Amino acid sequence: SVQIVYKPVDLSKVTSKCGSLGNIHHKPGGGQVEVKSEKLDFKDRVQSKIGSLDNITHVPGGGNKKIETHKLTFR
Amino acid sequence: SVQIVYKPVDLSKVTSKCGSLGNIHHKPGGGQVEVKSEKLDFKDRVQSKIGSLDNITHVPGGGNKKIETHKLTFR
Amino acid sequence: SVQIVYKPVDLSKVTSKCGSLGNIHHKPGGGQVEVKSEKLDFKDRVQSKIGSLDNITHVPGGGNKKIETHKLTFR
Amino acid sequence: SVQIVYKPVDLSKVTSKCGSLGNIHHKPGGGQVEVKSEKLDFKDRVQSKIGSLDNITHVPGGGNKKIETHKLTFR
Amino acid sequence: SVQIVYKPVDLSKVTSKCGSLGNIHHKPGGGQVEVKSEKLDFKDRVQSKIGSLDNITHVPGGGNKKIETHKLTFR
Amino acid sequence: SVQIVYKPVDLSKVTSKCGSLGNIHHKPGGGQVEVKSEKLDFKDRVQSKIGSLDNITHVPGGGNKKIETHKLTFR
Ligand SMILES: Fc1ccc(-c2ccc3c(c2)[nH]c2ccncc23)cn1
Ligand SMILES: Fc1ccc(-c2ccc3c(c2)[nH]c2ccncc23)cn1
Ligand SMILES: Fc1ccc(-c2ccc3c(c2)[nH]c2ccncc23)cn1
Ligand SMILES: Fc1ccc(-c2ccc3c(c2)[nH]c2ccncc23)cn1
Ligand SMILES: Fc1ccc(-c2ccc3c(c2)[nH]c2ccncc23)cn1
Ligand SMILES: Fc1ccc(-c2ccc3c(c2)[nH]c2ccncc23)cn1
């Protein structure tokens, strides 16, 4: 005989209050970029990125995160 | 005979209060960039990034995080 | 006979109060960058990053974190 | 004989630059107001104001002012 | 004979630069107000103000001011 | 014979630079106010103000001021 009771209770709270949020300024890559190449030999795969790439401004009002995992394994 | 009771109780709290949040300024890469190359031999894979890349401004109002794992293993 | 009772109680608290938060200035890479190369031989993989990359401004209103793990193992 | 030449030259400048302007919160009179009167005799004019009156939020983008007066008086 | 030349030259400058401006919070009169009166005799004019009155939030982007007066008086 | 030349030259400058400006909090009158009166005789004009009145939050981006007066008087 085997009896297993799995009764986790979650009454938790993840909250945030922000009176005002803003005046955010993100300016990447305002400088001049010059790339001058001459007599280059590439014998394999080439990946090149020039300029302003993949810059992120992320401004969530809350941005609160809850991660919870439940696992019952029986053998 | 085996009896197992799993009754965790969570009444916890993750909170934040912010009266005001802002006036954030992020300016990466305002300087001039010059890359001058000549007579380079590459015999394998090349990855090149030039400029302002992957800069992040992240401004969450709360940004509060709760991670909780529950694991019951029986053999 | 085996009896196991797992009843952890969490009434904890992770809180923060901030009256005002801001006037944050992050300026990486305002200086001039010059890279001048000549007669370089590369016989293997090359990774190159030039400029202002991967700079982070992270300004959470709370930024409070709770991590809790529960593990009951029976053999 | 009387000769009068009035030739003022104005090449002046009143300018302003604002990158962003906002997140302004004005909350007057959030408190409870109770006025309880009994057996008052007024024998003349009465002016009464109760509550939230005449509060101003004024947010001009420039709000720049130039005042100039020119006066030539001859007798 | 009388000769008068009035040639003032104004090449002046009143300027301002603001990168960001905001997150302004004005909360007057959040407290409770109670006024309890009994058996008052007024024999003349009465002016009464109770509550939150005439509060000002003034947020100009520039708010720059130039005042100049020119006066030529001849007798 | 009378010769008068009035040629003032103004090449002046009133400037300001502010990288960011904000997170301003003005909270007047958060306390409770109680006014309890009984058996008062007023035989003349009465002015009364109770609460939060005439509070000012003034946040100009520049707020720069130039005042200049020119006066030529001849008798
Ligand atoms: F289905 C998807 C969804 C998303 C992406 C994805 C997102 C972001 C980036 C990316 C790929 N590669 C990068 C390199 C440098 N910086 C940022 C990124 C690819 N496949
Ligand atoms: F079905 C889909 C859906 C999305 C994408 C996807 C999204 C974002 C990016 C991407 C691919 N590759 C990148 C490289 C650099 N930076 C960003 C990205 C592809 N397949
Ligand atoms: F599905 C996805 C989703 C996201 C990405 C991803 C995100 C960010 C970056 C990335 C890849 N490579 C980088 C290199 C340097 N700095 C930042 C990043 C790829 N695949
Ligand atoms: F033609 C006009 C135009 C405007 C007004 C005017 C404006 C503002 C106010 C006012 C009168 N009396 C007040 C008392 C207390 N606080 C503010 C004010 C009267 N006549
Ligand atoms: F033709 C006009 C045009 C305007 C008004 C006018 C405007 C504003 C206000 C006013 C009168 N009396 C007040 C008392 C308190 N607070 C504000 C005001 C009267 N006559
Ligand atoms: F035409 C006009 C224009 C404006 C006003 C005016 C403006 C502001 C106020 C006012 C009168 N009396 C006050 C008492 C206390 N605090 C502020 C004010 C009257 N007449």
UniProtKB/Swiss-Prot annotation, chains A, B, C, D, E, F:
Ranges for the Tau/MAP repeats: 2-32, 33-64
Localization of this protein: Cytoplasm, Cytosol; Cell membrane; Cytoplasm, Cytoskeleton; Cell projection, Axon
Modified positions (N6-acetyllysine) in chain numbering: K7, K13, K17, K27, K39, K43, K65
Glycyl lysine isopeptide (Lys-Gly) (interchain with G-Cter in ubiquitin) crosslink, residue number(s): K7, K13, K17, K27, K39, K43, K49, K65, K71
Feature type site, description Not glycated: K7, K13, K17, K27, K36, K39, K66, K71
Residues found modified as Phosphoserine: S1, S20, S48, S52
Modified residues (Omega-N-methylarginine): R45
Outcome when changing S16F: In PIDB; markedly reduced ability of tau to promote microtubule assembly
Sites bearing N6,N6-dimethyllysine, chain numbering: K7
Effect of S48L: In fatal respiratory hypoventilation; unusual apparent autosomal recessive inheritance; reduced binding to microtubules as well as increased fibrillization and aggregation
Residues carrying covalently attached carbohydrate according to the record: K43, K49, K65
Post-translational modification as stated in the protein's UniProt record: Phosphorylation at serine and threonine residues in S-P or T-P motifs by proline-directed protein kinases (PDPK1, CDK1, CDK5, GSK3, MAPK) (only 2-3 sites per protein in interphase, seven-fold increase in mitosis, and in the form associated with paired helical filaments (PHF-tau)), and at serine residues in K-X-G-S motifs by MAP/microtubule affinity-regulating kinase (MARK1, MARK2, MARK3 or MARK4), causing detachment from microtubules, and their disassembly. Phosphorylation decreases with age.
Tissue: Expressed in neurons. Isoform PNS-tau is expressed in the peripheral nervous system while the others are expressed in the central nervous system.
Oligomeric form and interacting partners: Interacts with MARK1, MARK2, MARK3 and MARK4. Interacts with PSMC2 through SQSTM1. Interacts with SQSTM1 when polyubiquitinated. Interacts with FKBP4. Binds to CSNK1D. Interacts with SGK1. Interacts with PIN1. Interacts with LRRK2. Interacts with LRP1, leading to endocytosis; this interaction is reduced in the presence of LRPAP1/RAP.
Domain remark in the UniProt entry: The tau/MAP repeat binds to tubulin. Type I isoforms contain 3 repeats while type II isoforms contain 4 repeats.
Disease: In Alzheimer disease, the neuronal cytoskeleton in the brain is progressively disrupted and replaced by tangles of paired helical filaments (PHF) and straight filaments, mainly composed of hyperphosphorylated forms of TAU (PHF-TAU or AD P-TAU). O-GlcNAcylation is greatly reduced in Alzheimer disease brain cerebral cortex leading to an increase in TAU/MAPT phosphorylations.
Function, in words: Promotes microtubule assembly and stability, and might be involved in the establishment and maintenance of neuronal polarity. The C-terminus binds axonal microtubules while the N-terminus binds neural plasma membrane components, suggesting that tau functions as a linker protein between both. Axonal polarity is predetermined by TAU/MAPT localization (in the neuronal cell) in the domain of the cell body defined by the centrosome. The short isoforms allow plasticity of the cytoskeleton whereas the longer isoforms may preferentially play a role in its stabilization.
Name the UniProt record assigns to this protein: Microtubule-associated protein tau
Record organism: Homo sapiens (Human)
